[PDB]
Each structure stands twice: as C-alpha cells, then as structure tokens.
Amino acid sequence: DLPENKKQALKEKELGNDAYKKKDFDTALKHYDKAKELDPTNMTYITNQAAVYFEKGDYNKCRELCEKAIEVGRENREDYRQIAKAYARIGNSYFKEEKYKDAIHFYNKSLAEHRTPDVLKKCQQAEKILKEQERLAYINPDLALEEKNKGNECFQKGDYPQAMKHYTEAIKRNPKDAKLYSNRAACYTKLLEFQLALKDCEECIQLEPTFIKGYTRKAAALEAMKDYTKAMDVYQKALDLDSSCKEAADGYQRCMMAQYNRHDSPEDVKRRAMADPEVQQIMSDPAMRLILEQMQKDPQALSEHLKNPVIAQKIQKLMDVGLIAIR
C-alpha cells in the first residue's frame, strides 16, 4: 500500500501520536523527527512537531515549523485543508500571545486555503478582542471634550446635524458621557428624528438616572409622536426627581389630556398600538382572544378575570394603548 519509507514514517507517526496523548512532548518530537526524515514530502510530521512547540508556549519555533510545512505541502500538492490547518495554528500562536491583529492575518490565509468552521469561529474571537482593544485605545476624554464643545457650538446655532456629527466623534472618544448622549438626543428631537432622540436619551438616563433633562428630552419626543401614554410616564419619572420641573410638569399635563383626545378614528389606534410588540403578543395569543370575546359578551367575565394580574395587566396594556375602551 505504501513505499517502505512512507510506512516507516507512518509507524513513527503513530508512536508519536501516542506520546502526545500522554503529553509526552519530547518523546513525540523524537518520533516525528524520524518520521519527517523518513517521509520528508509530508507536512504532517512538521505540523506535529509544531503542535509541541505551541503547547510549550514556544511560539516562534512552532511558527517556523508551520511555515515549512506550508511550503512543503504546496510543493508536494497536499490537500488545501492541510495547508489551512498549518495556517490556523499559526494564527493560534498569535491568538495565545494576544497578538490578535496577526492572528487574524494568519487566519485569513487559513480561510483562503479552507474555510474551516473552527477558523471562522476563532478568527471571529480574535476580531472581537482586537476591536474592543481598539475602541479602548481610541477613547480619550479630552478629545471627547473638544469634539463635544464643537458640537455644542454648532448645536447652539440651530445646526443640529453638524452638532450631531461632532457629538458622534465625542462619544467614540468618551462612551460614558451621559450628557453627550442627551445632547445628541436633542439634535434628533429638533430634526423630528424622535425615535433617535429616544435611544440616546435612554442611554443617558441609565448612565445618569437623575439627569432630569434626559427624561424631558425623551418625553418630548414621545409626546411629539403622539405617544402620550409613555411621554407622560417619562415626564413623570422626571417629576419624581424634581416635582417643580417645568417640562416634566407641563408636558405631563398636556399628555394627560392628549392621550385620550387623540384617539379619534380606530385606525389611528390600530396603527399605533400594533406597532408595540407587547400588544401584538396579546392579540396573537389565542388564550387572550378567547378571554376578550367573553369580556365583550359579559361584563362579569371582566369582573372576575381582572382579579388575576396575569390577565389584568394584559388587559390594562390594551386599555393603555386605546385598544380597549371601557364605558
């Protein structure tokens, strides 16, 4: 089946494999070195020796061996997957030394040889780690302050899009600046990007729960979008921090009436309420559909079912959005 020297290299390969199962790195190297000389046109002996050097932490030697194996496999037309494995291991030495940029370079070569699932996942980990390292390196609170300040100069002139651009650079430079998130939120509210005002206000608020302005900016966007029920709740959270606050009190009072005055046509109610996944779930759930039918037909079904919070709050949500009216 094999040339005698190939078979001899194989017997040594197998003995080397057993030596590695037992973590006998050095006996195994002896077996693979014999196997390598017996059958030199075969990457497997070289990559196995590299496996030792990788496990030992001797990454420079294992890299030289992987590179030699790659050159040999190409000369001798060995499977592309074998070449890929040697590259994957090279990327692994860099991964282990935390040189993720190099791990990626070599994993990219590995993928070209074969897009091995293991490489795809390991290189993704290398990217995630390197990307976080890069953001942390990017962060610099003083540059964030300079961009923030230019954003403020623009903002204050009514140039909200430019302010937003500078605020974006400032946040890349300082991610915990709660005030900065709310300044962007303001740009969006003024530009009618009310949805974006909400997302930046929410991060501002979680970072600084007492920043009453984060709440008034969010609530204003909600009120503007006729989401008076949440706008009132957000303005109220602002009132919980400071009951004398003007937007928190005034926006709250406008929402208090407007949330009912806007119902108008049921089409407005359906389009707005069904935008909310919570009521979509209530309506998509057949148990609720059955409960609702009983409720329409019998006010006592309501009297009894609403004593249990699992139903009472599904109903309360449908009432809050205006889908269920009670007379």
Binding site: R77, N108, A112, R115
Partner: protein
C-alpha cells in the same frame, strides 16, 4: 452589419467581430490586434492608436491616455485630484467635471474624457469597418467590474459620440468568462476567478456562474499596479547602468526617459518569450547611444515584489466571496501582462498547480467575449 465588441482600456484597446460562426480579432493598420488607447493632438491632425502613441515623444503635453480614470467622475473627486498630478496633460474643472486641455493645431481646446474615449472608439469602429468592408454600428463595450453607474453611462455616451449603437455594457470579467465558454457548463458550476493584470491597473474578481447567469461575488485590486510599473522598474535598471557607464543620470531627461521606457516595454514583451532582451537606443542622452540588455531572471528580480503583490488581492477576493481555493473551478488570465511566466508561476503556486486558462490570448479575451455577446444580442 456584423456585431462587434470593443475592449476599452487605459493604455490599450481591441475590437473583435463575430462572423461566419466565430470571433475574429481585427488587427489595425500597424498589424496590431491590440492598439494603444492614445490620442495625440498634433498641430496637423488628431491621431488615434499607434499613430498617437508614437507622438508621445514629440507632443506629450498634447497627448492623452487613461481617459477611464477621469470618465464618470467629478472634478473634485480625490482620484481625479491624485491621478492628474502624474500626467503631462492638464485636467480642467468644467461644471465639476474634469475636461482635458491640450493644444490642437495651435489652439487651446479641452475635451471631456468621454470625448477622448469616443475618439478611441471611433478608431476601433474604423478598424472594424475597413476590415469588414462596411459601416458597423452594432457594438458591445466593456467596463471594469468596479464601475459605478455614471461611469457606465459615460462609456455608453462615448460610443454614441463615436457613432455606435451601443447595444450593451459588460463588466470586463464577464466578457472574459464568455470568451472562455464558461456560460456553457449546463450546471450550477462554475466559481471562476478572473485575474486581470493590465496596463495601468490590476483587477481581480470572482464571478459565480450558474447556467449562463453571472454574479460578481467579489472584487479586489490595485489601482496603481499593472504592466506600467514593471516597465518602470525596468527603466530604473537601465538608467542605473547608463549612469554607471557614463556618470550621467538620465532619469531627469524626459525625452530620454520616454524613449527608454518605450524600449523597456519592448524588452518586457521580449522576455515573456525569450530569456534575454536587448536595449537598443540611438542618442538616448546628450547624443549618447545606449546599448545594453536584461535577462528574464534580472527582470523578475527588479519586479519580484510587484509580482508577489498580485496575490494579495487574490486572497482578498477569495475571502470576500467566502470561497476557498478548492472551490474555484477555473482560473482565467486576462491582460497582456499575464503572459509573463512569473505571473503564471505565481498563480499556479498560489492555487496548488491548478491550470490557468490560456486558450484565448489574455489580451484578446475581453474583446473576444464582447464580440460574442454582441453577436448574441444581434442574433
């Protein structure tokens, strides 16, 4: 009138015709199937092709090339702003659109890049008409795969100016795939890597072909790598030798350089066949005749990195296409520079001995493919 296809490059172009069951490649008046994408505005005539290329020696400020680098672009476009710095001709802002200024018959004139291209296309039209014995308007013009919409329309308009019925615009790698019969697999196969090492650019792309339908999955390339920089390394070799023999650096003498460079191109072509080429220029510098040589091995050493760098875009395209090497069913060579044995060797090593598809001359395959598609559109 028989349909034609035109291969429109930055330094060269070629026209094919489909007649009597096959594509013929039509040589121009100098016997060249591939003729320069040069226009020379002399003080007596507007020359196109080799007539124009040969005038770069005499009126370089009035000759043009690389029209495609300006076509479809805004004047303020960073590409325009960078590339003009390396040209003998002036790029002009006319409505935030580059226009090229030359002196023609002593007059100051400027033409849009599209006009320059139409002049080139007109010449290709004349070549085809003279060959066939009749006017031909039915044509297919190819473009680089990375072209945007303004660029494709601008190319089509250049055809309109030339007087062609532009039937279609085709990406250069699709045309090559057509030329090699890869649209006749009858399968969901093949994944084909097309490697275009051209005059001033290197374009690599992966096309996946499924029973005649083509998709570009990935592109990669180098906008400042092509055959011209191999010629540039060759110029530096010869300049250094001239300098050692005469203690004279001739790289600052534009006439000496243009003539040396032209000879270098010829030596490079010689070396794609032989292992030796001669450099033979009378009065190269200050009346000094310069006679020397280069071997294939020396050329490869001068350009060893240029050749190796062509594989980096290959790796990039494979990753972007999410393919490995094993998944490439075919390898296609496009561009005259792929005739260099070193390129072929690098691709074979990169791809572990897989054959390269050379059944059609690499610098004809695009014109060829365009002619085939043109034939289809017209029959």
């Amino acid at each position: 009138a028989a349909a034609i296809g035109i291969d429109l490059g930055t330094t060269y172009s070629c026209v094919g015709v489909f007649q009597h069951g096959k594509v013929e490649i039509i040589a121009n008046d100098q016997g060249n199937r591939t003729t320069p994408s040069y226009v020379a505005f002399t003080d007596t005539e507007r020359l196109i092709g080799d007539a124009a290329k040969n005038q770069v020696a005499l009126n370089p400020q009035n000759t043009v090339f690389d029209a495609k680098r300006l076509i479809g672009r805004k004047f303020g476009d960073p590409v325009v702003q960078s590339d003009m710095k390396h040209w003998p001709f002036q790029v002009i802002n006319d409505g935030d659109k580059p226009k090229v200024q030359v002196s023609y018959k002593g007059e100051t004139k400027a033409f849009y890049p599209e006009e320059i291209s139409s002049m080139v296309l007109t010449k290709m039209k004349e070549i085809a008409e003279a060959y066939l014995g009749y006017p031909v308007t039915n044509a297919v013009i190819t473009v680089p795969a990375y072209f945007n919409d303004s660029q494709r329309q601008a190319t089509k308009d250049a055809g309109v100016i030339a007087g062609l019925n532009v039937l279609r615009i085709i990406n250069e790698p699709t045309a090559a795939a057509i030329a090699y019969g890869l649209d006749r697999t009858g399968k969901g196969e093949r994944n084909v890597l097309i490697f275009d090492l051209g005059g001033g650019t290197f374009d690599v792309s992966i096309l996946t072909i499924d029973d005649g339908i083509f998709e570009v999955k990935a592109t990669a390339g180098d906008t400042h790598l092509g055959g011209e920089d191999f010629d540039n390394r060759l110029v530096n070799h010869f300049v250094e030798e001239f300098k050692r023999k005469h203690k004279k650096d001739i790289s600052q003498n534009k006439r000496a350089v243009r003539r040396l460079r032209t000879a270098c191109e010829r030596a490079k072509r010689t070396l794609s066949s032989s292992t030796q080429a001669s450099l033979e220029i009378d009065s190269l510098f200050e009346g000094i005749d310069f006679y020397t040589s280069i071997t294939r091995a020396r050329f490869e050493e001068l350009c060893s990195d240029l050749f190796r760098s062509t594989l980096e875009p290959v790796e990039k395209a494979l990753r972007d296409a999410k393919l490995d090497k094993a998944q490439i069913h075919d390898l296609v060579l496009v561009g005259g520079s792929t005739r260099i044995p070193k390129v072929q060797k690098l691709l074979q090593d990169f791809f572990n001995g897989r054959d390269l598809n050379k059944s059609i001359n690499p610098d004809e395959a695009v014109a060829y493919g365009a002619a085939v598609q043109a034939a289809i559109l017209m029959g």
